[PDB]
Amino acid sequence: QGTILLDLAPEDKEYQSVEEEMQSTIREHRDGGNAGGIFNRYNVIRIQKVVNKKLRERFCHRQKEVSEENHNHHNERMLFHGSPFINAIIHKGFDERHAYIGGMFGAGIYFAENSSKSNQYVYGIGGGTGCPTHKDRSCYICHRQMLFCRVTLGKSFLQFSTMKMAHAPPGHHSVIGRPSVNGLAYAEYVIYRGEQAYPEYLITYQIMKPEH
Numbered sequence: 382q383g384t385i386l387l388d389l390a391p392e393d394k395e396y397q398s399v400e401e402e403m404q405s406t407i408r409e410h411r412d413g414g415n416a417g418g419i420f421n422r423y424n425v426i427r428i429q430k431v432v433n434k435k436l437r438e439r440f441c442h443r444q445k446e447v448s449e450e451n452h453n454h455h456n457e458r459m460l461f462h463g464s465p466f467i468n469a470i471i472h473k474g475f476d477e478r479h480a481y482i483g484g485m486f487g488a489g490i491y492f493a494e495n496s497s498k499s500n501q502y503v504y505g506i507g508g509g510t511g512c513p514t515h516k517d518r519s520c521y522i523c524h525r526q527m528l529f530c531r532v533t534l535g536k537s538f539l540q541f542s543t544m545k546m547a548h549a550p551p552g553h554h555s556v557i558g559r560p561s562v563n564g565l566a567y568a569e570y571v572i573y574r575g576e577q578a579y580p581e582y583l584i585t586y587q588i589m590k591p592e593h
């Protein structure tokens with residue numbers, strides 16, 4: 382039994398709540414739109430819920446463990462994740478063994494509370510070379526995907542200056558760093574264990590051109 386993908390109807394309050402959080406967390410990045418493209422709204426064309434019994438059990442077991450090490454607060458949070466491994470992730474779950482040891486904060490899995498930040502990672506670091514078909518980081522044609530996940534943060538460690546960690550600091554279960562661009566800092570939430578994140582919603586969308 383693998384993963385079941387369930388479509389949510391747009392009139393479903395669940396669909397509406399997820400699209401609302403995605404649309405409303407679009408922020409300015411002072412990058413000129415280089416990484417994720419130029420837009421100020423998304424055309425959300427599909428929202429599917431990822432249902433996988435085995436994964437959920439892995440996740441909840443770990444959330445209990447974190448509860449017990451954090452004075453009964455697992456500190457769960459709904460965060461967005463954009464990357465090129467989404468399809469692999471929805472079928473097998475997050476696997477930290479595939480993590481890049483050279484991340485600003487180490488070999489962990491990264492999340493953000495702003496959908497526009499996550500959109501910058503859909504095609505790779507800094508937006509890589511853009512969509513496969515058009516090699517366009519601001520492609521209005523190709524459908525993108527991003528996950529809205531339940532992330533178990535437990536006790537988070539606030540990191541300012543870069544630190545190439547392999548695991549959460551002793552006594553902690555996640556790392557939160559506030560990175561710099563050309564003035565704006567947005568938080569990055571990092572975990573180092575695949576089971577501290579569950580890919581709740583699979584969002585299929587397109588960025589939209591600023592209207593004329």
Ligand SMILES: CC1(C)CC(=O)Nc2cc(NC(=O)c3cc(-c4ccc5nc(N)ncc5c4)ccc3F)ccc21
Nearest residue numbers: 461462463466469475476479480481490491493499502
């Ligand atoms: C831009 C930002 C902070 C926010 C966001 O939504 N995505 C994002 C993603 C990353 N990268 C990762 O989290 C990352 C994640 C993986 C990773 C994790 C689990 C996997 N599981 C499977 N099953 N397959 C491949 C996987 C790759 C590998 C390298 C990475 F660099 C870095 C920064 C961000």
Ligand SMILES: [Zn+2]
Nearest residue numbers: 512515520523
């Ligand atoms: Zn394209």
